Amino acid sequence: DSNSGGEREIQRTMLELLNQLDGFDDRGDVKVIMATNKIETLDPALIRPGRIDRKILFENPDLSTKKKILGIHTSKMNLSEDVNLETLVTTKDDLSGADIQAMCTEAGLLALRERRMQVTAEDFKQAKERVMKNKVEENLEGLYL
Amino acid sequence: APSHLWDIMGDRQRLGEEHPLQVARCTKIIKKYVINLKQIAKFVVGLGERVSPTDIEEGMRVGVDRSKYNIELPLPPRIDPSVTMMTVEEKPDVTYSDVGGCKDQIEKLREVVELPLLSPERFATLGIDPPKGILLYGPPGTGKTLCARAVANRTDATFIRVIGSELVQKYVGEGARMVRELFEMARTKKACIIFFDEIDAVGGARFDDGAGGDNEVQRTMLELITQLDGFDPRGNIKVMFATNRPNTLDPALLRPGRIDRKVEFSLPDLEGRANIFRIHSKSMSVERGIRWELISRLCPNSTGAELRSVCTEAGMFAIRARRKVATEKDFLKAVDKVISGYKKFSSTSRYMQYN
Amino acid sequence: KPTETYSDVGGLDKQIEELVEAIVLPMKRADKFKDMGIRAPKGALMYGPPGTGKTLLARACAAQTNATFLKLAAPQLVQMYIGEGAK
Amino acid sequence: GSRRYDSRTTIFSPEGRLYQVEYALESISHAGTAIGIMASDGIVLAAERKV
Amino acid sequence: NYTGWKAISVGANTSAAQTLLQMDYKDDMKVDDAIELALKTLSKTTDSSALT
Amino acid sequence: GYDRALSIFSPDGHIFQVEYALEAVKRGTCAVGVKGKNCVVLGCERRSTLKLQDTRITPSKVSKIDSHVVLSFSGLNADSRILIEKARVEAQSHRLTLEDPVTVEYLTRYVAGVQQRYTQSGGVRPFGVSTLIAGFDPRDDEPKLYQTEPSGIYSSWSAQTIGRNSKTVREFLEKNYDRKEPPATVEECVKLTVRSLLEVVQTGAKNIEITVVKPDSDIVALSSEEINQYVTQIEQEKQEQ
Amino acid sequence: LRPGRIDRKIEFPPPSVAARAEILRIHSRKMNLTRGINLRKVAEKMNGCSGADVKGVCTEAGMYALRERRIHVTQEDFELAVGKVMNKNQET
């Protein structure tokens, strides 16, 4: 509400991106990438079908993929002997790739208060519970159990 | 190296007291010429040495000397706008044969544009009036802009492509000047072509109530209509209106006399989509003995932009599937990929009929 | 003077007589209107649907009358400078 | 015309779900909470009033 | 849509209340022990300071 | 009441209400089933997002329409109840009207026929639920597995899956399973259903529910302990082979 | 709200009687005071006041001292300062 286009600036700004991807003469050098949470609300004419031949969908990873993702963030992290990677993945339920890094960052902050070189297993238990509760708010959306 | 040859004239074309000229415009002509400067200052002078009395015209930029003001050389008017200098393109890559299909929508555009330019004496025998404007809208993705660049190739003259968001400027009232910038070059450069892209953001008839600011857009058309059809019926070249939203356009803009030939693109049928894959068969790699009529038949009615994506993706299966050249098996996978796989948004395919 | 006259259209004679009594008769007959004590008309609004008459009949008024014509466009009166539109 | 004022309360979204049903689920989070537990000898119910 | 639930929480802080109820849930929990578990959840998950 | 027609033809010839309703199934639980010589099996999964669900008081994913025929739905668990209740009333109505027990072919045409009404009735929306009707006709030992699509089209399938990760399971049923040579025993039909659920459930136990349908009005649902017995034997023959 | 942007969310509780007791003495430390007052008694009369309201009482404490033309601030000014600030919060 601090920027007023009067609904007329809506088309002039959006169609400018459309005319540069269609009417503009190019041999295919310019590569324009567009991504956001939901692209369905956007005008599909602005998407300019036939110029973009790649539609990539992303979903939540399974238990097999999260084991590889968890090892990436913990590669540079010092872990104790009792901490197992397969244990934390089993606890993770309905989490994306950003939720996995949040637990590794929060677990590092819990041990940062006590200033420990190797993060024990008690810090990961308290970190995984606070992320999925206070940090991540899981709504119902489409559910029907 | 080339600078040494021009240094010989440096004793004349540089040190001379003539060249330091002050550019201005003559407001009043008495046959005493009242000339207004850029500093908001005016004066009255006569002719010069080589200045002809018939060269000075009303409302034309006329350069004068800096010290003692005297008319020296005339200059073309409308020197302020720098925007329309970049609107003229040169040699578009799309040729006349790049449009796929034998569809008669091609024959209608060449007779109302290319025919009077190439053969102006053909219609002069019957004593008729060639159509001034045309109409091309269609659904998005049919290659409408390809037909705009195809006519510019055969024309071999000045072509102007105007963006729908280019006319509206950052000030109120400057958009009215933007319209006079286009039609001024029509008299300067004869036998050219002007093109408007996405005229919906330009076109008026937005009424009034509830926005309060919609009157800034409609004033561009009121200047555009006046400069097109005015009091004095001034016109030469052809005007092209193109947009993807025919519903939001001014119903007065769609009325004839500013537009005669109306051509709306449609969905190519089994015979129409057949030539789309044939013009693309000359490119890429096509296996000998493959019938493209079965590929276009399995694909339902859709826009031409999604038809070229089939041939583009068909060559991409050989990389992952370990193939030499694109075969018929990889063509069937593109039907379930380019069409059936992409059915979720990111497409028009007759999505917007009106809004 | 333009090249357009009143003979290039038909069926509009009903609206043509309205323009004759507006910008035409007060030119020659101004001496007659002063005797009746009535003021000459200052103008008339012509709208209709777009594409009928309008600028065409204005050309016939600037031709047969054989007088000076000065065109002033409404959309040309909007400028970015304050006061330039009123100037 | 009755088509304009009708907001089409029940329609399928492009994602394959319902609009007003997803919006009705948010009203539960903005309302009073309700908690219950099924024990061996009975069931304990609990809630809290808002405002 | 409806199914059976041993311990369910529907309302404000749905995922926050179900976390504390799942860890302390027991199959041998009686009625007196179930009241304490449901009461301690409302205290931590509310928006107030004290609990009346 | 509400007479406004929700179903409108798209300019391409499709229907927005019918097309968008098909995605309610693809977002639902995977329902896969196979049929043998004398037997037929219908498997289904469960959502692992929420726990502490009592199994006894939870309604089964495979609803029993009659003794010799059952129904297995997927997608939305809400609109599926309307199709199940009206199919059970017709089961007693057809038994009362024609004095004949209902068959699998008639029950499929009824469930698909009801869905075709809401698409053609102004003021209602089509079902986003896909149901799998399987059973044995009276005095017939040949299993009949009919798929019911939300669009109203019914078809017979030896092995077919619906729900999320459908394209993954369909490719699994077109290779390891043969339509011309189905298994002749019940144990082989159960092991094939478990393997089809390993690519979706992803190492789970209480989330797998398999219902075995047998002729002569015999319905036996595999418990949690009986399903895990087949999982142990498959995992030993999977990584080792 | 989702992680990856804000890694720490700190909830600020509203000031209390014990909280405003230590805040009142800091803002008043830059001006003249009187040992005959009470730190927790002045903050006890105020309820639900923000940090700007505590500074407002300290700022207005010297305003009433200018009317009496005195260089000290006694309990008479604090009683008048609180009554003026409490009326501003309840207004509009």
Q: Write the burial class of residue F64 (CB in 10 Å: 0-12 exposed, 13-18 middle, 19+ buried).
A: middle
CB atoms within 10 A of CB B63: 16
Q: What does the longest C-alpha to C-alpha distance in chain G come to?
A: 59
Interchain proximity A53–B313, CB inside 8 Å? yes
Q: How many residues does chain G have?
A: 92
Q: Are F6 and D10 in contact (CB under 8 A)?
A: yes
* Interatomic CA distance for residues B15 and A143, integer angstroms: 85
* Interatomic CA distance for residues C12 and C49, integer angstroms: 14
Q: Per-residue DSSP letters for B29-52? A: E---EEEE-TTS-EEEE---SS--
B262: which strand partners?
B135
Q: Are B267 and B302 in contact (CB under 8 A)?
A: yes
Q: Write the burial class of residue B321 (CB in 10 Å: 0-12 exposed, 13-18 middle, 19+ buried).
A: exposed
* Interatomic CA distance for residues F69 and A71, integer angstroms: 49
Q: Are A8 and B213 in contact (CB under 8 A)?
A: yes
> What SS3 class is residue B135?
strand
Q: What resolution in angstroms does the PDB record give?
A: 3.8
Closest CA to F83 of F119, F114, F42: F114
The residue type found at A36 is T
**Positive/negative CA dihedral, G44, G47, G52, G53:** negative
* Interatomic CA distance for residues G85 and A79, integer angstroms: 56
Which run of H or E residues covers position B239? strand B238-242
Q: CB neighbours of C81 closer than 8 A, spacing ≥ 6?
A: none
Residue in this structure with the two tokens 């330091």, named with its chain if needed? B20
The residue type found at B291 is R
Order of strands across the sheet with D43-47?
D43-47, D34-38, E7-10
Say which DSSP state E35 is in: H
Tokens matching residue E44: 């931590």
> What SS3 class is residue B161?
strand
Interchain proximity E14–D48, CB inside 8 Å? no
Rounding to the nearest 10 degrees, give the CA dihedral for residues A53, A57, A58, A61: -110
Q: Are B126 and B161 in contact (CB under 8 A)?
A: no
Residue in this structure with the two tokens 């509780």, named with its chain if needed? G13
Q: C-alpha angle B107/B108/B110, rounded to 5°?
A: 65
* Interatomic CA distance for residues B58 and B42, integer angstroms: 15
The residue type found at B40 is I
CB-nearest to F54 from E2, E6, E21 is: E6
Which run of H or E residues covers position B64? strand B61-65
Say which DSSP state B27 is in: E
**Residue B355 to chain C, least CA–CA distance (Å):** 24
Q: How many residues does chain E have?
A: 52
Say which DSSP state A28 is in: S
> What SS3 class is residue A18?
helix
Q: C-alpha angle F51/F56/F60, rounded to 5°?
A: 85
* Interatomic CA distance for residues D27 and D46, integer angstroms: 19
Interchain proximity F20–D13, CB inside 8 Å? yes
- Angle between the N-to-C axes of helices A97-114 and A63-73, in degrees from 0 to 180, rounded to the nearest 10: 40
Sketch out chain F's domains with CATH numbers: 1-240 (3.60.20.10)
Q: Are B246 and B240 in contact (CB under 8 A)?
A: no
F220: which strand partners?
F212
* Extended strands (E) in chain E: 7-10
Which run of H or E residues covers position B21? strand B21-29
* Interatomic CA distance for residues F162 and F132, integer angstroms: 9
Number of H helices, E strands in chain B: 11, 11
Interchain proximity F54–E5, CB inside 8 Å? yes
Q: Are G38 and G28 in contact (CB under 8 A)?
A: no
Residue in this structure with the two tokens 């903050």, named with its chain if needed? G43
> What SS3 class is residue F99?
coil
Q: Are G24 and G31 in contact (CB under 8 A)?
A: no
Strands B193-197, B261-263: pairing kind: unpaired
Is C49 annotated as contributing to ligand binding? yes
Q: Are F125 and F6 in contact (CB under 8 A)?
A: yes
Q: What backbone torsions phi and psi does residue D35 show, to the nearest 5 degrees?
A: -135, 140
Is B138 annotated as contributing to ligand binding? yes
* Interatomic CA distance for residues E40 and D46, integer angstroms: 11
**Residue D18 to chain E, least CA–CA distance (Å):** 14
> What SS3 class is residue G41?
helix
* Interatomic CA distance for residues B302 and A139, integer angstroms: 38
Residue F28, sorted as left (phi over 0), alpha (psi -120 to 50) or beta, turns out to be: beta
Tokens matching residue A135: 């940090």
**Residue A143 to chain F, least CA–CA distance (Å):** 9
Buried b (16+ CB within 10 A) or exposed e, C46-72: eeeeeeebeeebbbbbbbeeeeeeeee
Q: How many CA atoms lie within 13 A of C51 on its CB side?
A: 9
Tokens matching residue B6: 């021009």
Residue in this structure with the two tokens 């399903």, named with its chain if needed? F227
Tokens matching residue F205: 């136990």
Tokens matching residue B270: 């089994």
Q: Per-residue DSSP letters for B298-323? A: HS-S--HHHHHHHHHHHTTHHHHTT-
Would you call A41 an interface residue with chain D, using a CB distance cutoff of 8 Å? no
Q: Are A18 and A51 in contact (CB under 8 A)?
A: no
Size of interface D-E (CB pairs under 8 A): 77
> What SS3 class is residue B55?
coil
Distance between alpha carbon F239 and the CA centroid of its chain, in Å?
Answer: 30
B204: which strand partners?
none
Q: Are E14 and D29 in contact (CB under 8 A)?
A: yes
CB-nearest to C75 from B171, B223, B257 is: B223
CB atoms within 10 A of CB A75: 8
* Interatomic CA distance for residues B211 and B222, integer angstroms: 19
Would you call E5 an interface residue with chain F, using a CB distance cutoff of 8 Å? yes
Closest CA to B157 of B128, B183, B131, B186: B186
> What SS3 class is residue A137?
coil
CB-nearest to E16 from A133, A140, A145 is: A133
* Interatomic CA distance for residues F159 and F182, integer angstroms: 10
Q: Are F193 and F33 in contact (CB under 8 A)?
A: yes
Closest CA to A53 of B312, B13, B255, F14: B312
Q: C-alpha angle B198/C78/B199, rounded to 5°?
A: 5
Would you call A141 an interface residue with chain F, using a CB distance cutoff of 8 Å? no
Interchain proximity A101–G4, CB inside 8 Å? yes
Q: Are B242 and B137 in contact (CB under 8 A)?
A: yes
Strands B21-29, B33-36: pairing kind: antiparallel
Q: C-alpha angle B249/B272/A47, rounded to 5°?
A: 45
Q: C-alpha angle A53/A54/A58, rounded to 5°?
A: 155
Q: What backbone torsions phi and psi does residue B342 show, to the nearest 5 degrees?
A: -95, 10
**Residue A62 to chain F, least CA–CA distance (Å):** 8
SS (H, E, C) B168-220: CCCCCCHHHHHHHHHHHHHHHCCCCEEEEECHHHCCCCCCCCCCCCCHHHHHH
Buried b (16+ CB within 10 A) or exposed e, B280-308: beeeeebeeeeebeebbeebebbbbbbbb
Q: C-alpha angle F223/F34/B335, rounded to 5°?
A: 130
* Interatomic CA distance for residues A48 and A45, integer angstroms: 5
Q: How many CA atoms lie within 13 A of G82 on its CB side?
A: 14
The residue type found at D32 is G
Q: Roughly how many angstroms between the first and final C-alpha of chain C, as a whole number? A: 27
* Interatomic CA distance for residues E14 and D30, integer angstroms: 11
Distance between alpha carbon B350 and the CA centroid of its chain, in Å?
Answer: 25
Q: Are F135 and F104 in contact (CB under 8 A)?
A: yes
* Interatomic CA distance for residues F158 and F162, integer angstroms: 13
Closest CA to F131 of F210, F44, F54: F44
Distance between alpha carbon F209 and the CA centroid of its chain, in Å?
Answer: 12
Residue F152, sorted as left (phi over 0), alpha (psi -120 to 50) or beta, turns out to be: left
* Interatomic CA distance for residues C44 and C56, integer angstroms: 16
Q: Are F50 and E2 in contact (CB under 8 A)?
A: no
> What SS3 class is residue B164?
coil
Chains that touch E (3 or more CB pairs under 8 A): A, D, F
Would you call G9 an interface residue with chain A, using a CB distance cutoff of 8 Å? yes
* Interatomic CA distance for residues B88 and B13, integer angstroms: 32
Tokens matching residue B99: 């449009």
Q: Are B177 and B122 in contact (CB under 8 A)?
A: no
* Interatomic CA distance for residues B203 and B199, integer angstroms: 6
Closest CA to B25 of B81, B76, B88, B68: B76
* Interatomic CA distance for residues G45 and G68, integer angstroms: 24
